[PDB]
Design a protein around this ligand. Sequence first.
Ligand code: 8D2
Lengths: 196, 198
Amino acid sequence: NLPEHWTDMNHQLFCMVQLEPGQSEYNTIKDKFTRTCSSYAIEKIERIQNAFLWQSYQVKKRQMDIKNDHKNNERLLFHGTDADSVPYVNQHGFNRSCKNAVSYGKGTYFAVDASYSAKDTYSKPDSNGRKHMYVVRVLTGVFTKGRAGLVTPPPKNPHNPTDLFDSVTNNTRSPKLFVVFFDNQAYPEYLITFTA
Amino acid sequence: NLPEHWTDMNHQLFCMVQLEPGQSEYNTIKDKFTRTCSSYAIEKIERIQNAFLWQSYQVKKRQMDIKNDHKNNERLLFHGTDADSVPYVNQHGFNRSCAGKNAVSYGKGTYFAVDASYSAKDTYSKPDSNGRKHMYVVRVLTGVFTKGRAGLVTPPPKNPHNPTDLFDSVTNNTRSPKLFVVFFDNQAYPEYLITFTA
Ligand SMILES: O=C1N=NC(=O)c2cc(OCc3ccccc3F)ccc21
């Protein structure tokens, strides 16, 4: 059940599609980035068409929508990474088992603001100065404040220790980062290649 | 997509079903266990009906069946664990972030045994305060595998010049596999829980 806005993949299951500047999709993704990264220079934006990752993510989404008994489980967030990680993420998504602060738990970190992900410690500039940031669909669901050393989100009620929050954050009232602890809770939707 | 022989769970997402000795389903698991653990005695065997784990696992199996073309991607393996872990595994399956270092490490992942005798070691199926040991029987997507290495946090690439095209799992020995390590969520479905004693 591959999304309408995807382009034909000639019966293949993985493709990176460079977006056309000035069309609705490119402008929408560029605006989300330029909200906080207007001083940067965008070289290109690519749509990640990964059928397998999409399938696994949509299954997790449908499960979270049932468990939480609403939609609103999804947020669009940013993730800066190094050039050498880009092929892995494009193909396999985010892996908590793969450096950098993990103060809110041993998961994959997503930023609310592109400017946070634009830090060199996250979107490490490559031998030619290029920086890489994903726009990510994240199943944040019902979240709570994180803490160091978590390997999963805490339980909602320690009377039912296996009924977990879906994600953790730095701050529940005004979140700036989210951490997820399971594969296929995050779909890398766009890759932005940019410079300082 | 839930299997038709599962008990009706009446819109519930999770059920443990106690099997009856003399049913083929119970006896095949008992035989698989006693092949290497005839010194121990089974208290009971429960079928794990976890709708969400099943759905996510079956999606990964379909994907690996498509990717590998005409491989037997799935093996039925054993996993010994402590009583404190059983509620989490039942509900959430096998989490590599919780895995112990194995006495012979072939990678940082979840370990599964070919032989119930291996999983029956107290180091894995730690006896609880009542002397009960717990072992899962697990559908594992072993796929195409290679000998692992202690440093691994994912299976290695098949080809060093294409680092993202991975083996599905690793083993101790490709000619005589006795253990498999998996590195991703939803690559293993806990199908039965064996409760057993000395
Ligand atoms: O874009 C990112 N890419 N990879 C990251 O690891 C990452 C981590 C991240 O917050 C880490 C963090 C910040 C402040 C305090 C404690 C923390 F743990 C935010 C964005 C990113």
